[PDB]
Every structure is written in C-alpha cells, then in structure tokens.
RNA sequence: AGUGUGGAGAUCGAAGAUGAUUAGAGACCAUUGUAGUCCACACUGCAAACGAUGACACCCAUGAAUUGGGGAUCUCUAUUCGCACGGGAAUAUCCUCAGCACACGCGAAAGCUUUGAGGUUACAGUCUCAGGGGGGAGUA
RNA sequence: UGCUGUUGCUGUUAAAGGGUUCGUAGUUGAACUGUGGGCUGUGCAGUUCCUGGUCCCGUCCAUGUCGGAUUUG
C-alpha cells in the first residue's frame, strides 16, 4: 500500500494548471498549507499538504453509499460548470448560483434537502451554505484559498479557487480520485474525460 | 404601463409553453393568446398579449428568465472534442511549465521532486 | 461505561459520543457535532469494510480548528502522512 | 446614559494625551478641542468657471499652460456648526463607524 | 508579584483545559506544584510533566488528556480536622463521588480520601474534578 | 390530522419502526424537527403535559395595543426526558397549541445520579449544575434520598416531569419573571449530560447514524 | 475660576452701559466695558479632575497598522541620496522588547476582549477605597 | 435576605474607584537543602529468536512523461 500517493503526472498537472498558487495575503489558518512567497507576493502551497487533503476528501466521499447525499455547491460562476459534471460522474447532488438561505433548515419547503456531506468551492462566497450546514450536523469539505475563513469547515483542501482552470482540475482530480476508489476505474491508465469539460461557459 | 405580477407571471407561462407566438406583432401574438388562455377579461389578454411580445422579441436579444427548452442545444453546444487539448497543450511537449524559484524549492524537496517538462524563469 | 447500580444494572439513559479532539461529550442539543467517515482502503485502492469515523464537538468547528484537529487525528490514526 | 461612541467623539483614547488645546470654530467661535472639531482642507478656485473664461482671456501671461491661483484653507468646525452646514450629517447606527481617510 | 505560585500554576492548567489544549507550560514550578500535579496524575487527570531546569525555578510542561473540568487553589488554605472533610466535600466538590480535595498534612500532599484513611488532617490546597 | 406525511428523513425512520427510541436520536445529535417523532417513540400513558405560564404581551401601534399571548408548555416522561417550549399567538387557545408542539420538539435527556451508595434507581442529579436564562440562574445540587424536591413552585414542576425526586436548589436573579425562570431550570437540566465524570471516560466505539444505515431505505421513500 | 501684594495691560470679556428683538427680554444678536484674561511671589484644593472603569501579578486567537530601541539580511539582499554633526540618512523583508490604539467568554442590555467589563454559584492570586429604595442633604 | 455577603454582594451606564503621586501602622509576599536502595514471588508498560506480509533494492520489459509484473529477490 503505496497507492494514493501522488505521482509525476498529478504534480505536473497542478503545476501546469496553476492550482499551486495562492492569493497575496494570508489567513492564520491555511498558514501550514502555505509554503513561502514569490516576488509577486503570492503564496505557494505544499503540493504535499494539498494532495493528502484530496484523498482524505475523496475517502470521505467514497464512503457515502448513496451519492445523492453528498452536496456540492458554489456561488462562483468559475466554479459552476465544475460542480455540474463532477456531480454527474460521481453522482452527487449539486446547487450553484445563489444558495437559497433556508434549504437545509426549512421543513415545509419542497426544495428542502438533507445531505450527509457538503462540498463547497469557496468558504467565503458560500457562507450561507456552511452556516446552515452547522445547524443540521453536516460535515464540510471545502476548497480553500490561503485566505479562506475556516469557520465550520471540517476538511479544507488548498487550491486556487480563482480562475477557471485551477478549479476544474480540482474537481477533476477528485472525481478521478473518488472513482479510482468507488465505481471501478482502471488505475493503471489515464482516465477518460477531459479537463476541458470542466470550465466556465461564457461565449 | 406597469404590469402586475399576474400579467407578468401568466405571460411567462405562455412564452414558456408556446412558440406558436413568434412574430413581434401584438396582433398575431394576441390572437394566439385568447384562444389558449382564459383570463375572463379582455384587458388581461391585452396586457398579456402586449408583454408576451416583449418577451419573445427580447429572447432574440439573449436569455430571459423562464428559459426555453432550447437548452438541449444550449447544453450540448459544449463541444468537448479537442486535440488533447489543454491539459497536454499545457505541458507543451518539451516546453516546461513556468515554475517559480520557490516552486522549484518545492519540487526538489518533494520525493517526486520535479516532474519532467518543468522549467523555471 | 455509565453509573452502575449496586446490583450491576446499568442506569444510564444513553452514553454520549466524545469529540476525538477535545474529549468532550457531544450533547443531544449540539447541532454542529459532526461525524466524518473516512473510507478505509486496501491495496490496489479499493474500499472495503471501513469503520474509522471521527466525532467533532460543536464547540470546535465554529472557531475553525476542526480542520487542524482532523489533521491531528488522521495522523494519529495513520490515515494521513506527515512529510 | 448610553455611550453613543467607543470614541466619545474625539481622536483621543484613554491613556493618551489628556488635554488637547482647543481651537476656534470657523463660522461660530465655539472653542472645541482640536481632536473633536471636524476638519476639512479645501483647495478652492478663486473664480467660477465661467468667470475664468472671462479673466483667463483678458490676461497676457495667464491662462494657457499656466493656470490661476487657488484658495487653500483648513476649516475646523464645531460639531454644531458642522451639522447645520451639512458638512456632516447623522448616520444610521450600523454605519456610524466608517472612516474615509484620504484614499484617492 | 507572584503571591502564591500554585494560584498561578493551577489557573493556567484550569484555563488551558477549558480551551482544549494538548499541553500547558507553567511558569514557576515548585515543590508544591509538582506534588500537587502528581496527585492529579495519580487519578488520571494529567498525562505527563517535564520539569525543565532554568537553574532558577523550573518550567513544567503538562500533557493534558482532556479529563479535567476545573483546578482550583484555595488561597488562604483553611485547616481540616478529619471531621471537616464533609464541609469541603460539600461546598467545593460537585458530587460526593468523583471530586478530590488536596491537602497538606504531616505526611504530605494527598487527597482527602488518602487522608481519611490515614486519619491525618491538614491544610487545604485545592481541588480538581 | 390524517395519517401524517414525514417531511424529514428522521420522521421517515420513525414512522417505520427503524428508529425505536429517542436515545438513538439523542446519541447522534439530531434536530427533532417534526413533533410526531416524539408521539411515536414515547409510549403514551407516559407523556404528560402542563402549561407553566400564560401572559399577554403588547406591541404599541397607532391606535390601540396589539396583544399577543406568550405561553409556556412543559412535557416529559416522568423518567428521563423533558422539554419546554414557549410559543406565541393571537389568542390563548392558539398559543397553547403552538406551545404544546414546541415542547415536544425540544425534549432533551436528563441524567440521574445518586447522592450516596448507588442503590435501586437514581433519585437525583449526579452533580452540582447551574443554568442561566436571564438575570435568573437556577442552581441544582444533588440531594440525599428522601429530601424531596426543594425548589420554588415553578421549578418543582419542571423537576417533577424530568424524574428528579431529590434536589436542593437556589435561584438567584429576578425570579419573578417566569419567562426566564422556566428556561433557566431547563438549561440546567440539560447540562447533566455535558459533564464528563470518570465513569464516562472510556472509549466508546462509534456507530453509524440511523439515517446513514437506513440511507437506502430513505432513498426509496424519497424516490 | 477665585483671593493677597507688585507688574502688565494688545486681544477677548463676568458686572455695567447702550441699540435691537419681544406681549415682557438686564437675556440669545450688535457697538462697548470693569474685574479678569498674561507674568513673579503667596494662598485656595470645590471639575463631566471621565475610560464615569482603583493599584500590582498571571492566562488568553486574528488581520492590517503605528511610535521608541534592538537584531538579521553585508528564504528573506533589497531600493533612493553622497569628507564634513556622517564607516551616514531614510526605506524594503523578517524578528523582537516596550508604549497609544482599529475568536472564546461575559453581560440586564448597550456592549467589553492579549489596552477585559473574560478566565466567578464549577463562587478563594494580593491590598485598598466607596455603595445599601428615592427624598430631606452634602443640609443641620 | 447572597437586602451586611468569612462561606457569599455590588461598584463603565442602575447607589458606589479617593483628582494624581509618595507613605507609616496593617495585611500579603518568589525558588532552593528532598524522586533511598537492593533480593524473592507475583500483577502492568516500554532486545534474543522465529515470521513472510510491506516498503526499499533489483530484474524484465522499456514506457518520451499517470503500465507493470519477476523470483531467492
């Protein structure tokens, strides 16, 4: 069992897809994830710490035996399409756009939903989902900038949440990683779909 | 001059449910209303028929709330077919991806170290 | 694991879960109070028979040491790698 | 009764100075401490724009790549004289704390 | 002006147990602070110490296992005759089962339960539940 | 009304027999968001209800004074569980209705210890406890068997529904306001499961949520 | 602010005078003006003398700043100025001590927070000052 | 009546921190002289010898860079 260690293609992609770069400033938490600075001021993430949070997330998710429990969200356009297809391959429910306050905590409503797990692109721009996830006993798995407020966020993956390309990989690597585990994909070979298929629209 | 949510809403159910109403003509787009819709008064249709043509005309401008079933072509208009592309256009076939002096000190410390096809500036 | 009668009859109403970070009891009324079930893995990378689950108390999530605390636990459990 | 400000309307915290020589108020004469009083620095044109075209026309040296002088003065207002002049107005409780400082 | 070096010591342990810390670092160790801690450690309310030498007064580093609810010092150190364990049991401890009152006796620093059995009385130091 | 339609996963696992007791709902800390979850799990002849206080409350408007009635309900099995809801309405009868409900939604476990050698069944709170709803906090102290409940008129009832036979109290604050007094004794009864006693320190082994085991049985009921 | 003896006496200005305002209006406004405002030497000790928060000690998370001093760069090393009060001055990155300030918990609430009103019914670090319904009265 | 409060009160705004500093009676006051050993039988926790179920080495492939297997390894 050296399996689910990262390896030269995994790294290259991130290094190529720029997921390793942070915003200029820094929160207290997400310092252990930060590695040094650049001359541009940006923070750089350990590809090591980043990685192990991914399989940890992926092990949380592959332990959900009804994938309609898991709930993936973002309010960021750049993260709207990534949510979508990831939710097809893995099966998870998804809600993008503007999270309606109250979907978890209002019974009477029809759109009321009771997930086990939540996944959020941005711990800032989704504060309304995380907050209500705290009322209902929902663990949270968040892709986090160096900045991200980690209030009520149980498992936080360091990423670029900024920029289209940086996010699409990060759901692409999860779904790939999640499916190498659940749903039987052949670990020996590159996987089927293209990252191009997780990217934001505009014409 | 301003249309109540009743005019607004019902007229969104028509355009959602009828593409018989097409021409910017208030008069054509009216005569399709009253047969299909019962509002029990004329002004409602006269209002509804007026706003129903605003919706259609504007659809040609761009999308409008209560989006049409044409999304089938919208969605699948995403054409994922590419040479690899971007992922392996990024490794740029012997062109190392730009990597900082730190992100080198990142790699050289990693067990994996630096994945091939990785350059610095 | 509860207060026993002199006759040996377990007298508790129920035995609450304890945060695996702080070792505080999780109370019925505490609505953060998470379980996080990580699927246990075996060679070739397939899930089988995974019991390891974490319990975090409502207190700790709201300050944002949940993440820091789940790093500490998964490392004591060996679910993670320090490097 | 209730404290309306953490600041008590001053630039002076407790364990700082303690006195702060008072100044006269533009428009009134009210003495208020130099912290309290509401300062504004002005940079005012001598002449209304349509009065410039007249004078800037009538001058041999002035008005081309060279401009006119301006009036430069600080103004320090009593907190009464400031509200009446509308240079400052009351604000809703949530917005009471906003500092514009100088930015651009 | 460190008046009582237990007062300072057991607060830190108390107020850093209420925060869930894994370890506490206590500023002025002393012969009493250790003997008090070793009573806490006997009943399972503390894992480990390090007593570090500064050459002057040490620094104790205590590993907390999460099992302490409170640590007091009783400042004036009132006396106990062995008939007075019922006051202190009654006033300062939550139940008549699980609390402990720590005393100085002729025989040393020990619990109120180690004292009832040896029949010494002494002066009160503190408690821990 | 009719046979009623569960709106939440736990209401479904309750209507099916597959959640048989509150101490499963209490263990995995879960909101009871629909009251008929209580009516099933507790056998009847057990739940017992009273109204602590009902007092009118007036919003000042133009013209008169809009008056609402705020009402406090108290529910418990005389073993264990208790809850206290407080709701409001435009007339008493409605307020008493909503109060009856919110009391069942708030039921909470009460712990019972001894004052002494542990014999028979527990008669008291296991340890000293306070809870504070306002200016008014209500301290609950263990008591020797047979003392009976020593407490004001109001907390006697709140303590009788929970099943505590023997307790000394003292309540500091303005205790006249039974809005707060009623919740303060309640909040103190909560804490009896917050406190970690050397009994309760040993590792439990985790278990799976009811809604996680039965997640499959839930998806066929939803879908 | 007052008070005593000398000085000073520009400005402002209790009292005072005058004109307005007003039903009345020495009031508020305007032209004045004495004591005073200023100084030395003596008294007085009566402030919303306020942070309405006693003093000494400990514990306590975060973000950008700021004033002293110091250290490193000579993984961070770098910018601009050039015998003479100068092997210098300022800046940048990071650290550090010391000062004024812009998460828990507590609180009746307003709010307080490593500058506490936190670490208190789970009540105990030390010393001290003041309070005990409102008046009468800080009076006799 | 925890409305005299040692147990046990309150003092930013409700009644209440002296205007500041020095200071006697008075109260309070930092650490240290200090794990005693060994023998027997018996309960606990942390190097002989045996495992082959791992990772490391290596082999075969070579795969431009995310297969692998290979026996003694």
């Amino acid at each position: 069992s050296k399996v689910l260690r990262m390896k030269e293609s995994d790294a290259q992609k991130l290094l190529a897809m720029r997921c390793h770069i942070g915003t200029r400033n820094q929160s207290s938490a997400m310092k252990k994830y930060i590695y040094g600075r650049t001359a541009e001021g940006s923070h750089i993430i350990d590809v090591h710490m980043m990685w192990e949070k991914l399989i940890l997330a992926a092990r949380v998710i592959a332990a959900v035996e009804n994938p309609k429990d898991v709930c993936v969200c973002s309010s960021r356009l750049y993260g709207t399409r990534a949510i979508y297809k990831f939710s097809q391959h893995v099966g998870t429910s998804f809600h993008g756009g503007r999270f309606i306050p109250g979907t978890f905590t209002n019974q009477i409503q029809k759109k009321f939903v009771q997930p086990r797990v939540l996944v959020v692109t941005d711990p800032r721009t989704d504060h309304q989902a995380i907050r209500e996830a705290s009322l209902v006993n929902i663990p949270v798995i968040a892709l986090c900038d160096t900045d991200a407020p980690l209030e009520y966020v149980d498992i936080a993956i360091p990423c670029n949440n900024r920029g289209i390309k940086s996010i699409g990989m990060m759901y692409w690597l999860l779904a790939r990683e999640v499916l190498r585990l659940r749903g039987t994909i052949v670990r020996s070979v590159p996987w089927e779909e293209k990252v191009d298929l997780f990217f934001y629209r505009d014409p | 001059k301003i249309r109540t949510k009743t005019v607004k809403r019902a007229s969104r159910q028509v355009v959602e449910k009828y593409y018989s109403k097409l021409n910017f003509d208030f008069y054509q787009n009216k005569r399709v209303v009253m047969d299909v819709t019962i509002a029990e008064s004329k002004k409602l249709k006269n209002k509804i028929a007026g706003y129903a043509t605003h919706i259609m005309k504007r659809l040609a401008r761009g999308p409008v709330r209560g989006i049409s079933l044409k999304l089938q072509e919208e969605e699948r208009e995403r054409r994922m077919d590419h040479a690899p592309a971007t992922s392996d256009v990024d490794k740029a076939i012997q062109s190392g991806v730009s990597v900082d002096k730190k992100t080198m000190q990142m790699l050289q410390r990693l067990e994996i170290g630096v994945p091939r096809r990785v350059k610095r500036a | 694991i509860g207060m026993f009668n002199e006759e040996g009859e377990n007298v508790d109403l129920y035995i609450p879960r304890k945060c695996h970070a702080t070792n505080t009891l999780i109370e019925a009324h505490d609505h953060a109070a998470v379980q996080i079930s990580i699927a246990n893995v075996g060679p070739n990378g397939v899930i089988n028979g995974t019991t390891t689950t974490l319990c975090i108390a409502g207190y700790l999530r709201s300050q944002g040491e949940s993440d820091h605390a789940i790093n500490h636990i998964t490392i004591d459990r060996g679910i993670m790698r320090i490097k | 009764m209730t404290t309306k400000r953490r600041n008590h309307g001053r630039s002076k915290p407790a364990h700082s100075r303690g006195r702060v020589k008072p100044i006269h108020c533009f428009n009134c004469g009210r003495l208020t401490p130099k912290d309290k009083a509401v300062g504004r620095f002005v940079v005012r044109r001598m002449l209304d724009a349509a009065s410039a075209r007249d004078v800037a026309e009538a001058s041999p040296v002035y008005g081309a790549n060279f401009p006119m002088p301006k009036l430069y003065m600080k103004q320090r207002f009593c907190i009464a004289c400031a509200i009446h002049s509308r240079t400052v107005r009351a604000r809703p409780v949530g917005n009471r704390k906003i500092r514009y400082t100088k930015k651009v | 002006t460190m008046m009582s070096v237990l007062a300072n010591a057991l607060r830190t342990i108390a107020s850093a147990e209420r925060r869930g810390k894994r370890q506490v670092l206590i500023r002025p160790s002393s012969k009493v602070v250790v003997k008090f801690l070793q009573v806490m450690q006997k009943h399972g309310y503390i894992g480990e110490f390090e007593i570090i030498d500064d050459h002057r007064a040490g620094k104790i580093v205590v590993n907390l296992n999460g099992r302490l609810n409170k640590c007091g010092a009783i400042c004036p150190r009132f006396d106990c005759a062995t008939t007075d364990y019922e006051k202190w049991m009654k006033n300062i401890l939550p139940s008549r089962q699980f609390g402990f009152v720590v005393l100085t006796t002729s025989l040393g620093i020990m619990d109120h339960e180690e004292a009832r059995s040896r029949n010494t009385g002494g002066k009160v130091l503190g408690f821990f539940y | 009304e009719k046979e009623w339609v569960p709106c939440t996963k736990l209401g479904r696992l309750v209507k099916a027999q597959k959640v048989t007791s509150l101490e499963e709902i209490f263990l995995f800390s879960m909101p009871i968001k629909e009251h008929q979850i209580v009516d099933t799990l507790i056998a009847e002849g057990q739940l017992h209800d009273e109204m602590m206080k009902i007092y009118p409350v007036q919003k000042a408007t133009s013209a008169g004074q809009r008056t609402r009635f705020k009402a406090f309900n108290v529910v418990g099995d005389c073993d264990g569980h208790i809850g206290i809801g407080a709701r409001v309405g435009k007339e008493v009868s409605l307020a008493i209705r909503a109060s009856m409900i919110a009391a069942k939604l708030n039921i909470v476990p009460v712990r019972r210890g001894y004052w002494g050698n542990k014999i028979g069944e527990p008669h008291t709170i296991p340890m000293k406890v306070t809870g504070k709803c306002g200016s008014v906090a209500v301290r609950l102290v263990p008591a020797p068997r047979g003392t009976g409940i020593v407490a004001a008129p109001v907390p006697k009832k709140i303590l009788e529904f929970a099943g505590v036979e023997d307790v000394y109290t003292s309540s500091r604050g303005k205790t006249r306001t039974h809005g707060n007094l009623i919740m303060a004794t309640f909040y103190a009864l909560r804490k009896t499961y917050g406190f970690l006693t050397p009994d309760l320190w040993a590792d439990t082994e985790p278990s799976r949520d009811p809604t996680d085991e039965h997640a499959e049985l839930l998806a066929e009921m939803t879908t």
Side-chain angles (χ1 to χ4, degrees), chain C residues 24-63:
Chain C
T24 61
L25 299 180
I26 286 103
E27 301 152 351
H29 69 280
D30 187 7
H31 292 162
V34 163
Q35 283 185 332
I36 288 167
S37 63
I38 284 176
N40 189 339
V41 173
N44 282 277
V46 169
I47 281 96
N48 282 329
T50 79
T51 59
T52 60
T53 299
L54 301 183
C55 306
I56 307 301
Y59 299 142
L60 193 143
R61 304 176 70 242
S62 56
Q63 292 91 7

Side-chain angles (χ1 to χ4, degrees), chain E residues 61-73:
Chain E
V61 179
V62 181
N63 295 341
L64 299 172
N65 60 26
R67 290 201 275 255
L68 270 173
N69 294 330
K70 184 69 168 296
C71 293

Side-chain angles (χ1 to χ4, degrees), chain A residues 139-180:
Chain A
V140 178
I141 300 163
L143 302 175
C144 296
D145 296 348
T146 64
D147 308 350
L150 290 178
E151 310 162 353
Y152 292 109
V153 172
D154 290 344
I155 295 165
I157 298 105
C159 298
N160 277 278
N161 297 339
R162 293 186 175 280
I164 313 168
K165 301 188 191 300
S166 58
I167 297 169
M169 283 292 297
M170 293 309 297
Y171 287 93
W172 187 78
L173 292 182
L174 281 178
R176 179 179 177 271
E177 292 164 350
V178 180
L179 288 173
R180 292 185 179 179

Side-chain angles (χ1 to χ4, degrees), chain A residues 66 69 107 114 116 137, chain F residues 9 29 33-34 212 215-216:
Chain A
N66 301 349
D69 283 342
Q107 289 161 321
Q114 277 186 325
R116 288 193 192 181
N137 298 330
Chain F
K9 289 177 176 180
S29 62
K33 198 171 287 291
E34 181 69 14
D212 292 344
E216 301 170 351

Side-chain angles (χ1 to χ4, degrees), chain A residues 63 65-66 69 104-108 112 114-116 135-137, chain F residues 7-10 29-31 33-34 208 211-213 215-216 219:
Chain A
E65 68 196 356
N66 301 349
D69 283 342
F104 303 121
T105 57
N106 237 326
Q107 289 161 321
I108 282 175
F112 170 68
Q114 277 186 325
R116 288 193 192 181
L135 301 179
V136 185
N137 298 330
Chain F
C7 49
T8 51
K9 289 177 176 180
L10 195 148
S29 62
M30 285 172 176
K33 198 171 287 291
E34 181 69 14
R208 188 188 291 273
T211 62
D212 292 344
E213 302 169 352
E216 301 170 351

